[PDB]
């Protein structure tokens, strides 16, 4: 299995799935480095974020548990196909990159917070992470290049 993938057992169906412990993504299909990648993200902050404030809300009061529930809802909607990643990043990300549909541009290792960096370089082009935790809050990451 590629970097970070493990074979897991679905609790509800008993069917096997695959989980990546670097990106926190899960998928049913069996999964099949560059100097820089380009990623967008959607950030949900909470009261324990390093800065519990965002361009969108002066005082962020939601709990970390509430932020994870929000993130998990956005992931469901994006995976369902009902909403594009860009649409939810623009509307709900607590990062000013929201106004660029979540795009952070290109970057190399050594620039971003480490769990974000590691998830970004372990994603395939076009792939989306699961919930990724940093000191800023909880991220959904989409690798675009
Ligand atoms: S597993 O069954 O313990 C499991 C763990 C997580 C997680 O902790 O992130 C997520 C999922 C999950 O996404 N289940 C639904 C489907 C499983 C295959 C891919 C899915 O969308 C399961």
From Swiss-Prot:
The keyword Protein transport does not apply. Residues 1-32 form the WW domain. It is found in: Nucleus; Nucleus speckle; Cytoplasm. GO terms for cellular component: ciliary basal body; cytoplasm; cytosol; glutamatergic synapse; midbody; nuclear speck; nucleoplasm; nucleus. Peptidyl-prolyl cis/trans isomerase (PPIase) that binds to and isomerizes specific phosphorylated Ser/Thr-Pro (pSer/Thr-Pro) motifs. By inducing conformational changes in a subset of phosphorylated proteins, acts as a molecular switch in multiple cellular processes. Displays a preference for acidic residues located N-terminally to the proline bond to be isomerized. Regulates mitosis presumably by interacting with NIMA and attenuating its mitosis-promoting activity. Down-regulates kinase activity of BTK. Residues 34-145 form the PpiC domain. The keyword Disulfide bond does not apply. The modification Phosphoserine is found at residues 53, 90. This is Peptidyl-prolyl cis-trans isomerase NIMA-interacting 1. Phosphorylation at Ser-53 by DAPK1 results in inhibition of its catalytic activity, nuclear localization, and its ability to induce centrosome amplification, chromosome instability and cell transformation. Ser-53 is dephosphorylated upon IL33-stimulation of dendritic cells. It comes from Homo sapiens (Human). One of its GO terms (molecular function) is GTPase activating protein binding. Its EC number is 5.2.1.8. Keywords: Acetylation, Cell cycle, Cytoplasm, Isomerase, Nucleus, Phosphoprotein, Rotamase. The WW domain is required for the interaction with STIL and KIF20B. Its main location: nucleus. One of its GO terms (biological process) is negative regulation of protein binding. Changing residue 45 to A: Loss of peptidyl-prolyl cis/trans isomerase activity. No effect on the interaction with IRAK3/IRAK-M. Abolishes IL33-mediated increase of IRAK3/IRAK-M protein levels. Pfam families: Rotamase, WW. Interacts with STIL. Interacts with KIF20B. Interacts with NEK6. Interacts (via WW domain) with PRKX. Interacts with BTK. Interacts (via PpiC domain) with DAPK1. Interacts with the phosphorylated form of RAF1. Interacts (via WW domain) with ATCAY; upon NGF stimulation. Interacts with PML (isoform PML-4). Interacts with BCL6. Interacts with FBXW7, disrupting FBXW7 dimerization and promoting FBXW7 autoubiquitination and degradation. Directly interacts with RBBP8/CtIP; this interaction depends upon RBBP8 phosphorylation. InterPro entries: PPIase_dom_sf, PPIase_Pin1, PPIase_PpiC, PPIase_PpiC_CS, WW_dom, WW_dom_sf. It catalyses: [protein]-peptidylproline (omega=180) = [protein]-peptidylproline (omega=0). Expressed in immune cells in the lung (at protein level). The phosphorylated form at Ser-53 is expressed in normal breast tissue cells but not in breast cancer cells.
């Amino acid at each position: 299995l590629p970097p970070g993938w493990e074979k897991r057992m679905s609790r509800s169906s008993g069917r096997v799935y695959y989980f990546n412990h670097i990106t926190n993504a899960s998928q049913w299909e069996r999964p099949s480095e560059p100097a820089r990648v380009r990623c967008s993200h959607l950030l949900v902050k909470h009261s324990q974020s390093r800065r519990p404030s965002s361009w969108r809300q002066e005082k962020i009061t939601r709990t970390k548990e509430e932020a994870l529930e929000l993130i998990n809802g956005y992931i469901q909607k994006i995976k369902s196909g009902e909403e594009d990643f860009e649409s939810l990043a623009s509307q709900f990300s607590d990062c000013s990159s929201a106004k660029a549909r979540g795009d952070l541009g290109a970057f190399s290792r050594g620039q971003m917070q480490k769990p974000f960096e590691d998830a970004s370089f372990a994603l395939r082009t076009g792939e989306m992470s699961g919930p990724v935790f940093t000191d800023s809050g909880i991220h959904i990451i989409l690798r675009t290049e």
